[PDB]
Amino acid sequence: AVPKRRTSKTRKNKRRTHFKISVPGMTECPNCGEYKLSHRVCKNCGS
Amino acid sequence: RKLGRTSDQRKAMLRDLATSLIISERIETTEARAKEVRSVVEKLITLGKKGDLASRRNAAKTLRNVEILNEDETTQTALQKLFGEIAERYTERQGGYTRILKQGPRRGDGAESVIIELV
Amino acid sequence: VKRTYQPNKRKHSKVHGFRKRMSTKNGRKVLARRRRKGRKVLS
Amino acid sequence: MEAKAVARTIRIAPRKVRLVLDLIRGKNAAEAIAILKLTNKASSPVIEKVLMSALANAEHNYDMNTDELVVKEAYANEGPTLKRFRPRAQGRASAINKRTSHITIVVSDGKE
RNA sequence: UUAAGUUAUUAAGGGCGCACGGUGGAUGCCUUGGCACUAGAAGCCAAUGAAGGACGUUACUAACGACGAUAUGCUUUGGG
RNA sequence: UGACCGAUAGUGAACCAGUACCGUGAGGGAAAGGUGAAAAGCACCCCGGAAGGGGAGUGAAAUAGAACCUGAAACCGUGU
RNA sequence: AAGUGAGAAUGCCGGUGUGAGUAGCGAAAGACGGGUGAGAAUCCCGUCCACCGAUUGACUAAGGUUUCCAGAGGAAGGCU
RNA sequence: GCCCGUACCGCAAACCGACACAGGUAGUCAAGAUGAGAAUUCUAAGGUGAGCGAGCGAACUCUCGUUAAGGAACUCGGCA
């Protein structure tokens, strides 16, 4: 129930290979000079 | 069907939202809550179309018996406005048709904010 | 649960104090030690 | 020519502010702010403020272009941490650390 | 063009070398503070209320020192 | 005066010391020095609610800006 | 002339790691509208709903020693 | 018509438990319906909505409800 040995800087950086965030949809507004969320609306993004 | 709290608690909350969305036109809440109050509000508008005594008594089993309208500057008690104004304004095949508009997430948590207005 | 050390003003000035330590010779030696050390609080 | 802008001491873990710095590295400023105004992270409005301040540094000191700008480097160094305490069970108490970050961002034009 | 056979490109990540950053306070240099002695003063204080304190006193500030309702001090010699 | 110490040393105490704190009580008892020759301690403009930056200015030096002489390892990053 | 040489004493003190973005975040039921602001699930007002109900009610005593009222906040503080 | 206490918490976020800790802390007063009752279930006053949330409805652990036909064949023992 307790780590027998300590992890290195190579085995610790290998586990953080999938630990990341994905990019958003960024549905560019038709004509308003803003940015609306995918299938959403904003006070600046007209479309 | 979806959940959230306990059987009794859920029921109570649902009734509150429905009554609050009948005397405020448009309101903003969460996604799940807006996708569950769009089936208990449309059924209430269907009972208002009939305009019979039986329906009126069945419409008082959900609508809260309070919330006296203050914007009408009178003694409107929800039901009257629903069985007089809301009912006398809809003639579509979707009875109490309502639309929902999604928006950005909240700051507190990550819940997706949404708006449900009457149509 | 009920713990120890029950606060009591009168009792605190009875068992200790400056009038109780200046009543015996054994308790008068504890006032000289603290004074020598440089304690800012004497009983 | 290039412009830089440092925050210096921010109440946020450096390992949590390094996850939003690997999404606006080597991109256009116009698309950089757009990506920062979509992510629902706790360190999204903070980085944006620094990036917006670095773009204004090359508009009054160098008076260069804005549409033709690209973020060169973007990292975050560690800063002084505060030591706290939390009472556990059986009288024993643990320790808590409040680390800070030194977010830095430099803007170039695709040439030295 | 076929059929057979020999070798590539990729880098999600990792490894080594080099260049530049950040956190941390080792090392070097310095001294208002100490330690061991030497020569010589000295070796007591107190019912004429002691040692040590409590509460106070500035023009403005909490400690620390000095001071006592004559309270950050008085009268008397000087030196300066 | 010294083939004594030079900030983990020398007194427990070079600075807020018998003080923070700990115990019903007798009692136990820390950590903490250094901008510059002189505050000349960043007038002014730009981004931000502010914090903090980028120019400019003071200086022999600003990678000397009060996390203020020098800044070593462990550890954390970016480019190649 | 010596306080003269460090890799080990479950050695003393300080700084930073690994486990890990993991375990945990310790009493009532909340829902919407308006307001304030750079920023609101969390602050202010309003309406409805619910919980304690010989008590999470009201008042003496012990004990603690300004936590009490008003105006202004930069953080630190408050398990968000 | 002298002297001392009088703010605020006080069955508790200010007392004793290192913590805004499911614990401990002497007395006085305490309404309606159902009832012999300070028991039991609702409620008037008064006090609060309790100090991280949002989705989903896997295994496994914990509290709780029901079950065809049989009825201790379970087990150290009708333990629960």
XYZ file of C-alpha atoms (C1' of nucleotides) in Angstrom:
641
model
C 0.000 0.000 0.000
C 3.167 2.210 -0.051
C 5.542 2.836 -3.038
C 8.520 0.413 -2.675
C 10.807 2.663 -4.814
C 10.689 6.348 -5.942
C 9.736 7.218 -9.575
C 12.306 8.990 -11.842
C 11.898 12.135 -14.034
C 11.533 9.898 -17.152
C 8.811 7.513 -15.819
C 6.912 10.523 -14.335
C 7.004 12.481 -17.657
C 5.889 9.306 -19.536
C 2.637 9.104 -17.476
C 1.839 12.783 -18.313
C 1.692 12.117 -22.107
C -2.152 12.022 -22.391
C -2.763 14.520 -19.517
C -3.768 17.566 -21.651
C -6.836 19.597 -22.828
C -8.444 19.550 -26.332
C -8.954 22.637 -28.597
C -12.486 24.206 -28.779
C -14.818 24.347 -31.838
C -14.480 28.167 -32.219
C -17.526 28.771 -34.505
C -16.364 32.071 -36.144
C -19.288 34.586 -36.127
C -20.686 35.283 -39.658
C -20.266 39.115 -39.525
C -19.813 40.903 -36.136
C -16.026 40.775 -35.487
C -16.387 38.454 -32.446
C -16.415 34.699 -31.573
C -19.527 32.590 -30.728
C -19.364 29.149 -28.999
C -20.275 26.024 -31.068
C -24.124 25.928 -31.321
C -24.373 28.944 -28.929
C -24.623 32.797 -28.962
C -22.853 35.853 -27.413
C -23.470 39.620 -26.858
C -20.575 40.416 -29.280
C -20.856 37.491 -31.777
C -23.991 38.493 -33.764
C -24.280 35.125 -35.592
C -36.413 10.510 -16.908
C -33.500 12.370 -15.196
C -32.814 12.974 -11.448
C -30.824 15.376 -9.198
C -31.933 15.193 -5.522
C -34.574 13.025 -3.735
C -38.039 11.949 -5.046
C -39.953 14.531 -2.910
C -37.307 17.318 -3.283
C -37.196 16.867 -7.115
C -41.041 17.084 -7.363
C -41.177 20.295 -5.239
C -38.348 21.993 -7.240
C -40.062 21.095 -10.578
C -43.354 22.739 -9.420
C -41.430 25.898 -8.322
C -39.672 26.295 -11.735
C -42.946 25.754 -13.695
C -44.780 28.430 -11.603
C -41.745 30.797 -11.892
C -41.696 30.331 -15.723
C -45.462 31.171 -15.924
C -45.202 34.593 -14.150
C -41.848 35.821 -15.605
C -42.076 34.825 -19.338
C -38.334 34.014 -19.843
C -35.984 32.589 -17.122
C -32.384 31.204 -17.148
C -31.265 27.986 -15.340
C -29.095 24.866 -16.027
C -29.266 22.484 -19.058
C -30.698 19.326 -17.373
C -33.276 21.432 -15.417
C -34.347 23.224 -18.657
C -34.675 19.834 -20.470
C -36.999 18.510 -17.691
C -39.229 21.607 -17.103
C -40.145 21.684 -20.848
C -42.505 18.673 -20.376
C -44.276 19.748 -17.118
C -44.988 23.299 -18.454
C -46.334 22.269 -21.918
C -48.800 19.848 -20.206
C -50.100 22.755 -18.030
C -50.717 24.899 -21.183
C -52.676 21.965 -22.742
C -55.067 21.981 -19.717
C -55.551 25.775 -20.107
C -56.759 25.328 -23.727
C -59.727 23.091 -22.699
C -60.999 25.762 -20.243
C -63.294 23.339 -18.336
C -63.833 22.944 -14.535
C -62.255 19.427 -14.390
C -59.035 20.667 -16.113
C -58.927 23.729 -13.767
C -59.022 21.399 -10.691
C -56.314 19.167 -12.298
C -54.197 22.291 -13.068
C -54.223 23.255 -9.341
C -52.436 19.966 -8.416
C -49.066 21.336 -9.695
C -49.237 25.178 -9.976
C -48.338 26.765 -6.580
C -51.364 28.333 -4.769
C -49.615 31.731 -4.187
C -47.160 34.027 -6.079
C -49.716 36.903 -6.412
C -48.736 38.827 -9.608
C -47.299 42.256 -8.585
C -46.577 43.493 -12.168
C -50.350 43.345 -12.957
C -51.038 45.633 -9.923
C -54.030 43.412 -8.918
C -54.714 40.011 -7.241
C -53.810 37.671 -10.172
C -52.959 34.213 -8.698
C -51.042 32.527 -11.607
C -53.920 30.136 -12.683
C -56.245 33.072 -13.640
C -53.503 34.531 -15.931
C -52.749 31.009 -17.311
C -56.494 30.277 -17.860
C -57.099 33.761 -19.360
C -53.937 35.230 -20.978
C -51.505 32.332 -21.756
C -54.415 30.052 -22.838
C -55.927 32.859 -25.012
C -52.725 33.434 -27.086
C -51.715 29.935 -28.345
C -53.462 28.109 -31.255
C -50.565 25.934 -32.579
C -50.375 22.084 -32.684
C -47.531 22.122 -30.081
C -49.873 23.595 -27.411
C -47.464 25.444 -25.076
C -44.496 25.374 -27.514
C -41.313 26.708 -25.797
C -37.761 27.339 -27.162
C -34.356 27.039 -25.362
C -31.177 29.093 -26.110
C -27.734 27.783 -24.965
C -25.024 30.207 -23.684
C -21.518 30.203 -22.103
C -20.573 28.203 -18.942
C -20.850 29.620 -15.360
C -17.816 30.901 -13.354
C -18.623 29.042 -10.085
C -18.589 25.522 -11.629
C -18.797 24.290 -15.264
C -22.605 23.998 -15.643
C -23.713 25.179 -19.141
C -26.093 28.177 -18.686
C -29.305 28.169 -20.828
C -32.446 30.366 -21.303
C -36.034 29.016 -21.763
C -38.536 31.633 -23.095
C -42.249 31.066 -23.970
C -43.277 30.936 -27.690
C -16.165 14.112 26.822
C -15.286 16.050 30.037
C -11.538 16.939 29.838
C -9.200 18.287 32.589
C -8.272 21.907 33.602
C -11.621 23.499 34.647
C -11.172 27.345 34.591
C -11.720 29.108 37.981
C -10.622 32.711 38.834
C -10.897 32.519 42.682
C -9.283 29.009 42.718
C -6.411 30.243 40.444
C -5.534 33.026 42.974
C -5.902 30.560 45.919
C -3.522 27.642 45.055
C -1.116 30.144 43.373
C -0.834 33.970 43.601
C 1.752 36.270 45.271
C 0.189 36.159 48.791
C 0.350 32.307 48.865
C 3.973 32.037 47.574
C 5.068 34.700 50.141
C 3.619 32.649 53.068
C 6.228 29.813 53.172
C 10.059 29.724 52.763
C 9.898 26.883 50.161
C 7.579 28.981 47.925
C 9.697 32.133 48.525
C 12.667 30.458 46.720
C 10.598 30.055 43.483
C 10.033 33.870 43.408
C 13.828 34.500 43.559
C 14.615 31.980 40.749
C 12.086 33.589 38.323
C 13.350 37.090 39.328
C 16.993 35.999 38.689
C 16.176 34.360 35.296
C 14.306 37.535 34.204
C 10.701 36.248 33.851
C 8.288 39.131 32.994
C 5.420 37.333 34.857
C 5.769 36.336 38.564
C 2.868 34.044 39.664
C 12.205 43.405 -33.107
C 10.126 41.719 -30.332
C 8.062 42.815 -27.269
C 7.726 41.027 -23.868
C 5.458 41.344 -20.767
C 5.858 39.568 -17.359
C 3.193 39.273 -14.593
C 5.566 38.491 -11.614
C 3.929 36.618 -8.630
C 0.441 35.119 -9.347
C -1.711 33.110 -6.855
C -1.964 29.926 -9.036
C -0.048 26.589 -9.177
C 2.614 26.644 -11.989
C 1.637 23.077 -13.106
C -2.002 24.233 -13.675
C -1.033 27.405 -15.657
C 1.322 25.315 -17.884
C -1.660 23.363 -19.356
C -3.115 26.525 -21.029
C 0.348 27.676 -22.274
C 0.678 24.623 -24.606
C -2.342 25.772 -26.711
C -1.304 29.374 -27.638
C 2.379 28.590 -28.465
C 3.456 29.411 -32.064
C 0.140 30.927 -33.281
C -1.345 34.294 -34.432
C -2.321 36.886 -31.758
C -5.835 37.187 -33.308
C -6.341 33.378 -32.983
C -4.475 33.363 -29.613
C -7.019 35.610 -27.766
C -9.915 33.755 -29.506
C -8.676 30.392 -28.060
C -8.239 32.045 -24.602
C -11.854 33.381 -24.755
C -13.286 29.834 -25.246
C -11.406 27.642 -22.691
C -13.239 27.366 -19.311
C -9.991 27.214 -17.239
C -9.228 29.229 -14.047
C -6.029 30.675 -15.636
C -7.645 31.812 -18.945
C -8.533 35.494 -18.162
C -5.157 35.978 -16.349
C -2.963 34.889 -19.337
C -5.239 36.896 -21.717
C -4.617 40.103 -19.666
C -0.801 39.570 -19.951
C -1.029 38.708 -23.704
C -3.244 41.810 -24.300
C -0.696 44.006 -22.413
C 2.270 42.611 -24.436
C 0.467 43.485 -27.732
C 0.077 47.136 -26.572
C 3.853 47.321 -25.810
C 4.718 46.941 -29.543
C 2.021 49.507 -30.545
C 3.358 52.590 -28.656
C 7.082 51.763 -28.093
C 7.722 50.228 -31.572
C 4.402 51.224 -33.259
C 4.454 48.012 -35.394
C 1.528 46.042 -36.954
C -1.038 43.970 -34.955
C -2.597 41.626 -37.592
C 0.937 40.512 -38.664
C 2.069 39.393 -35.149
C 2.933 35.878 -33.801
C 3.616 34.758 -30.167
C 7.299 33.618 -30.066
C 7.980 32.138 -26.570
C 5.526 31.501 -23.670
C 6.550 29.812 -20.360
C 5.956 30.101 -16.569
C 8.705 29.949 -13.867
C 8.031 29.011 -10.188
C 7.949 31.645 -7.387
C 8.044 31.803 -3.536
C 5.519 29.416 -1.861
C 3.647 29.951 1.468
C 3.615 27.191 4.159
C 0.263 26.422 5.908
C -0.952 23.704 8.354
C -4.034 21.401 8.549
C -5.014 19.545 11.797
C -5.469 15.777 11.103
C -6.626 12.968 13.468
C -4.993 11.719 16.760
C -3.354 15.162 17.378
C -0.985 14.919 14.343
C -1.121 17.739 11.724
C -0.095 17.783 8.007
C 1.330 20.598 5.799
C -0.086 22.667 2.857
C 1.880 24.583 0.148
C 0.631 27.682 -1.783
C 2.984 27.984 -4.824
C 2.980 31.003 -7.230
C 3.920 31.450 -10.941
C 5.906 34.000 -13.051
C 3.992 33.775 -16.404
C 5.999 35.434 -19.251
C 5.079 35.935 -22.967
C 7.110 37.539 -25.835
C 5.554 38.662 -29.186
C 7.582 38.709 -32.467
C 6.791 39.267 -36.200
C 8.436 36.149 -37.734
C 11.901 37.772 -38.107
C 14.866 38.887 -35.908
C 3.740 -2.378 -66.303
C 4.243 -7.030 -63.784
C 6.829 -10.719 -60.199
C 10.657 -11.245 -56.672
C 14.157 -9.115 -53.129
C 16.963 -5.250 -50.526
C 16.455 -0.365 -47.674
C 13.510 4.269 -46.229
C 10.680 8.409 -44.448
C 6.790 9.872 -38.993
C 7.964 11.536 -33.514
C 2.609 10.957 -29.438
C 6.486 10.960 -26.015
C 11.552 9.764 -24.011
C 17.603 9.846 -23.980
C 22.485 12.494 -24.173
C 25.287 17.268 -25.211
C 25.049 22.783 -25.524
C 22.803 27.952 -24.766
C 19.720 30.948 -21.730
C 16.006 31.545 -17.368
C 13.543 30.727 -12.135
C 13.305 29.012 -7.157
C 16.922 28.173 -2.910
C 20.592 30.674 0.543
C 26.080 27.341 0.475
C 30.884 30.041 -0.243
C 33.991 34.535 0.015
C 34.478 39.522 2.406
C 32.633 42.654 6.610
C 31.071 43.932 12.056
C 27.411 47.419 16.237
C 28.090 41.294 19.857
C 30.605 37.766 22.541
C 35.082 34.556 25.126
C 39.879 34.289 28.113
C 43.039 37.084 30.901
C 46.355 41.560 32.898
C 47.235 46.128 35.926
C 44.417 49.012 39.180
C 39.428 51.205 41.694
C 36.543 48.530 44.223
C 33.954 45.178 47.230
C 27.815 46.460 49.241
C 21.993 47.848 49.592
C 17.699 48.437 53.657
C 12.404 51.016 58.770
C 15.754 58.451 56.435
C 11.194 52.342 53.385
C 15.650 48.109 49.798
C 16.145 44.484 45.171
C 12.282 44.020 41.755
C 7.691 45.479 40.060
C 2.209 47.681 38.899
C -0.110 51.921 36.894
C 1.193 56.643 34.751
C 4.277 61.263 32.380
C 6.092 64.110 24.838
C 3.696 68.113 20.454
C 3.234 63.589 17.536
C 4.333 56.326 18.028
C 3.677 50.715 20.104
C 7.895 48.594 22.312
C 12.775 49.667 24.954
C 15.436 52.836 28.295
C 15.147 57.174 31.531
C 11.318 59.921 34.927
C 7.512 60.199 39.318
C 1.056 64.200 40.019
C 7.428 69.476 40.901
C 6.557 63.021 36.232
C 11.145 62.597 28.590
C 12.330 65.887 34.803
C 13.396 70.427 39.338
C 17.239 74.284 42.744
C 22.467 74.818 43.524
C 28.462 74.400 41.081
C 31.107 74.325 36.961
C 33.086 72.698 32.608
C 31.576 73.831 27.914
C 46.154 42.837 25.550
C 45.364 37.782 22.274
C 49.586 31.942 16.149
C 40.613 33.614 20.591
C 35.032 33.410 17.525
C 33.240 36.058 12.880
C 26.084 35.059 12.255
C 24.438 26.485 12.195
C 30.600 30.207 15.238
C 30.801 33.366 19.959
C 26.588 34.031 25.624
C 20.190 30.837 25.519
C 20.112 36.261 23.327
C 24.913 41.203 17.605
C 17.845 42.096 15.503
C 11.333 42.349 18.246
C 15.104 37.122 24.457
C 14.315 34.905 28.859
C 10.518 37.384 23.898
C 6.729 33.959 19.828
C 5.257 29.584 21.700
C 4.340 24.902 25.317
C 2.356 23.303 30.505
C -3.122 23.410 35.915
C 1.810 24.232 38.292
C 7.444 23.601 39.472
C 9.397 24.495 34.607
C 11.041 24.226 29.242
C 12.630 27.672 25.744
C 13.464 29.220 19.637
C 13.904 31.493 14.326
C 15.751 36.172 12.634
C 22.645 40.840 10.593
C 24.358 43.240 4.994
C 20.480 48.533 -1.317
C 23.972 52.968 -2.395
C 29.317 57.080 -1.465
C 24.694 60.197 -0.885
C 17.168 58.331 -0.995
C 19.359 61.091 -5.596
C 13.535 55.201 -3.051
C 11.736 55.107 -10.371
C 8.921 62.732 -12.227
C 6.349 61.793 -16.502
C 3.748 58.508 -21.035
C 1.379 53.150 -22.395
C -1.750 48.198 -20.948
C -4.785 46.822 -16.175
C -10.233 47.743 -11.257
C -5.574 46.913 -8.677
C -1.207 44.012 -8.265
C 2.629 44.119 -11.692
C 4.951 45.103 -16.223
C 7.283 48.067 -21.056
C 9.731 52.874 -22.298
C 11.941 57.134 -19.877
C 14.709 59.265 -15.814
C 18.550 59.043 -11.036
C 23.455 56.411 -10.612
C 30.017 54.096 -11.781
C 26.456 49.845 -11.935
C 18.676 48.831 -12.078
C 20.162 40.897 -14.009
C 22.033 47.249 -6.874
C 14.346 48.462 -6.918
C 13.594 47.140 -0.018
C 12.057 38.475 -2.167
C 17.631 44.666 -2.315
C 26.603 42.660 -1.496
C 28.467 37.828 -3.812
C 24.342 33.740 -5.476
C 26.851 27.039 -5.176
C 24.026 22.188 -5.448
C 19.084 19.389 -5.036
C 14.627 20.833 -7.930
C 11.547 23.330 -12.148
C 11.251 25.103 -17.167
C 12.022 27.084 -22.936
C 14.897 26.687 -27.456
C 18.154 23.592 -30.121
C 51.329 26.064 15.837
C 46.629 23.314 15.286
C 38.822 23.438 16.541
C 43.449 20.207 9.899
C 40.362 16.604 5.443
C 33.164 13.412 5.733
C 29.191 8.782 2.185
C 26.894 5.885 5.970
C 25.919 6.687 13.549
C 16.578 4.411 12.410
C 23.127 11.093 13.248
C 21.264 17.452 14.310
C 19.281 21.749 11.379
C 17.581 23.985 6.614
C 15.849 23.664 1.506
C 13.474 20.885 -2.309
C 11.499 16.239 -4.391
C 8.472 11.222 -5.217
C 3.471 9.061 -4.013
C -0.435 12.946 -7.474
C -3.398 16.560 -9.980
C -4.208 11.200 -6.233
C -7.153 10.894 -0.588
C -10.096 14.580 1.412
C -13.257 19.455 1.290
C -16.488 17.480 8.990
C -25.068 19.166 11.100
C -31.780 21.752 7.587
C -33.851 22.028 0.847
C -33.887 24.974 -1.869
C -35.974 27.974 -6.751
C -36.424 32.285 -9.621
C -36.944 37.769 -10.317
C -34.616 42.757 -9.347
C -30.039 45.457 -7.549
C -24.588 46.381 -6.959
C -19.992 45.930 -9.441
C -13.733 45.202 -13.571
C -15.623 40.281 -12.164
C -21.741 36.863 -8.744
C -24.238 29.200 -7.930
C -21.777 32.111 -2.844
C -23.192 39.612 -1.152
C -28.312 42.950 -0.722
C -33.854 43.280 -1.124
C -38.649 40.406 -2.726
C -42.019 36.224 -3.394
C -42.875 30.977 -2.757
C -41.035 26.321 -0.475
C -38.821 23.536 3.734
C -36.309 22.232 8.686
C -35.910 22.549 14.500
C -40.332 22.427 17.351
C -39.323 20.282 26.364
C -35.760 22.805 21.074
C -30.541 24.650 16.558
C -36.397 28.993 21.555
C -36.016 33.086 25.680
C -33.335 34.461 30.075
C -29.702 34.141 34.971
C -24.397 32.028 36.540
C -19.308 30.199 35.508
C -15.569 31.251 31.809
C -13.355 34.182 27.686
C -11.668 39.493 27.472
C -13.375 44.042 22.676
C -14.979 39.205 19.127
C -19.923 44.702 20.087
C -21.689 49.713 16.293
C -20.532 52.766 11.839
C -17.254 54.011 7.364
C -13.400 52.468 4.200
C -10.495 47.557 1.974
C -4.486 44.697 -0.796
C -3.304 41.083 -0.151
C -2.661 37.289 4.050
C -7.122 34.930 6.462
C -11.932 31.665 5.706
C -10.809 23.640 3.413
C -14.200 26.528 -3.345
C -27.796 59.671 49.178
C -20.212 56.265 48.827
C -17.103 51.792 46.231
C -17.031 47.516 42.274
C -19.669 44.860 37.841
C -22.860 46.446 33.529
C -20.472 46.136 25.888
C -20.794 41.173 23.143
C -20.914 35.207 23.094
C -23.043 32.147 26.590
C -26.837 23.881 25.790
C -22.014 27.758 21.885
C -18.235 30.168 14.898
C -16.023 34.072 21.293
C -16.118 28.621 27.226
C -12.976 23.212 27.970
C -11.324 19.674 23.641
C -4.329 22.290 19.166
C -9.430 23.627 14.431
C -15.691 27.856 12.521
C -14.152 19.726 16.028
C -21.276 15.041 14.923
C -18.363 15.516 22.341
C -18.852 17.983 27.714
C -21.300 22.433 30.580
C -25.194 24.367 37.118
C -30.036 26.827 37.354
C -35.342 29.754 35.554
C -39.645 30.152 31.947
C -42.059 27.533 28.264
C -48.442 27.934 23.845
C -52.673 24.463 20.322
C -54.765 19.357 18.307
C -54.340 14.021 19.445
C -53.449 11.753 24.869
C -52.611 9.950 31.652
C -48.046 12.373 30.456
C -41.968 17.187 29.884
C -44.102 10.112 25.894
C -45.783 9.822 20.226
C -46.977 12.520 15.139
C -48.131 17.325 13.190
C -48.109 22.869 14.302
C -48.383 28.921 16.682
C -44.334 32.101 18.150
C -38.897 32.678 17.908
C -34.565 30.910 15.207
C -32.420 29.223 10.628
C -31.719 27.112 5.023
C -25.006 25.145 7.823
C -19.206 27.510 5.246
C -17.398 23.818 -2.508
C -20.621 22.743 -6.731
C -22.392 20.561 -11.797
C -23.459 16.069 -14.774
C -24.181 10.552 -14.831
C -27.318 6.678 -12.828
C -20.916 0.880 -13.895
C -18.420 -2.920 -10.426
C -17.652 -2.841 -5.104
C -18.678 -0.843 0.370
C -22.411 1.358 3.815
C -27.779 2.654 5.720
C -33.099 1.342 4.004
C -37.772 -1.369 1.479
C -40.189 -5.788 -0.795
C -40.029 -11.015 -2.366
C -42.588 -17.195 -5.535
C -42.317 -22.519 -2.916
C -39.925 -24.173 1.821
C -39.260 -22.615 7.208
C -33.147 -22.908 11.211
C -31.749 -27.336 6.572
C -27.450 -21.392 8.420
C -23.948 -21.325 12.545
C -19.108 -22.319 17.747
C -24.495 -20.530 19.190
C -31.749 -18.416 16.161
C -25.755 -13.851 16.070
C -28.802 -10.063 13.361
